């Protein structure tokens, strides 16, 4: 009963911590979830032969660009960590 949760940046980062502030928090969390999902699925799919490997290039797509996606998403991770700090 006595959890006494409260509500310039001191209230701003709490509103960020708030799971649902309608306009702001929903965006802030959904976009981060999309980033983490695309990051993990990209890390997974870099293994399938046709995806990114010499599994179908021996005859002759294997474009090494998911590394750039990993760089971008870890950039998002570190900037979000700085925001959390």
């Amino acid at each position: 009963d006595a959890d006494t949760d409260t509500a310039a940046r001191q209230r701003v980062w709490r509103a960020f911590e708030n799971p649902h502030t309608s306009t702001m928090a929903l965006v802030f969390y959904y976009v981060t979830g999309f980033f983490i999902a695309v990051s993990v699925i990209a890390n997974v799919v870099e293994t399938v032969p046709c995806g990114s490997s010499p599994g179908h290039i021996k005859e002759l797509r294997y474009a090494v660009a998911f590394f750039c996606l990993d760089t971008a998403c870890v950039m998002i991770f570190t900037v979000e960590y700085l925001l959390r700090l």
Binding site: S22, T23, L26, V27, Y30, V31, F34, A63, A65, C68, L69, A72
Partner: protein, 51 residues
Amino acid sequence: AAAAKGIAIALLVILVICSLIVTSVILLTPAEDNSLSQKKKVTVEDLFSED
């Protein structure tokens, strides 16, 4: 609901723009076709050939 759907569409747009930025990034350093001779090498026989 309706407001939730609207803000969901807003975040959908702001993630679509980021995805397009990612596509621009991956096309920023493309190597679709690499220029190469891809033909026969040079041997001693063609050295001694009339060509």
